[PDB]
């Protein structure tokens, strides 16, 4: 046992009290302070890292600037959404242990990640599941982009289900999130010297492959590769992950001819029409261009109509 003494009470910077539970890297179950011990049904998690941990500071800044409970609620009301998949930030603080300094952050507790469900379903999601997931991810992306951040690492292991509601998906991990537009000033098309990360090789954007800072189009492109991987179980460059030059070369060539990507990914003739249209729309985006999120959602909604369905918010997992 390190970091915390189990069952101990911790006080955040806003003087809110929390009790620490068992682990579930260094993440523990947590709940509001009370006479009860923290159980397995806990609604919160406490993430703890040394004070000098860069990703936890970055993540904390994202949450403090963009994921305040009320800030998310105002967006849900104005956009008439059922929910928003941005995890709620409950508080943070500093904790000293054995002469060492740590930073902690209280967040929403979630259920399983999509990567596990994906693997348990023989590495496939139905067209209904993919479209319903992507509509919710487009809601998240629009929100974080409108709050000056890009994620840069969208993937099934970073998508968590609501602990009590299996039809609500959340995008997590903002440790390597990037503030692309501080104070409304878009970053230039160049490398960010502070930024060292390039995302997950199989899903990362061409921009990240070219060593430039991630932008909005990059998040949309990553989602495009996720959709293909989910529908088919594969990506064309999957057996060459060790070589980034190869992966970038393939993505670049496939971006030039999306019909060829469709033919490679969906060998038996027809590919779902909305995927090619989505990729073609993302392809038209300039580096600093604001995406037209509603047109991207409209492309996906036509996918739901084609399969005799509608956006009823059912993930079908
Ligand atoms: C982020 C990955 C590593 C998920 C890790 N993760 C869980 N995370 C959360 N909430 C959570 C974790 C975070 F890091 C966050 O930034 C956040 F906003 C929310 N709930 C439940 C679990 N469960 C069941 C697990 O099995 C593991 C430990």
Author numbering: 20 to 43, 49 to 341
Sentences from the paper on this structure:
Members of the Vaccinia-related kinase (VRK) family of serine/threonine protein kinases are present in the genomes of all metazoans and those of poxviruses, including the family-founding member vaccinia virus B1R1–6. Here we present the first crystal structures of the kinase domain of VRK1 and the first crystal structures for ligand-bound VRK1 and VRK2. Ligand-bound VRK kinase domains adopt the canonical protein kinase fold, except for the presence of the additional α-helix between αC and β4 (αC4) exclusively found on VRK proteins. The ligand-bound structures obtained here for active VRKs are in a closed, active conformation and display the same overall organization previously observed for the apo-structures, including the position of the VRK-exclusive αC4 and the structural organization of conserved residues that make up the kinase hydrophobic spine36.
The most complete VRK13-364/ASC24 model contains residues 21–46 and 48–341 (chain A); and the one for the VRK13-364/BI-D1870 complex contains residues 20–43, 49–341 (chain A). Moreover, the co-structure of VRK13-364 bound to BI-D1870 revealed this compound cannot stabilize a P-loop folded conformation in this protein. Finally, BI-D1870 is seen in two different poses, supported by distinct hinge-binding modes. Both poses only loosely complement the volume of the ATP-binding pocket and neither pose induced the folded P-loop conformation, most likely due to steric effects with P-loop residue Phe48. Structural comparisons of the solution NMR structure, where residues (346–354) within the C-terminal regulatory tail occupy the ATP-binding pocket, and the ligand-bound VRK1 structures obtained here reveal that changes in the ATP-binding site are mostly limited to the protein DYG motif and to the P-loop. Overall, binding of small molecule inhibitors to VRK1 repositioned the catalytic lysine to facilitate the formation of an ion pair between this residue and the conserved glutamate residue from αC, one of the hallmarks of the kinase active conformation.
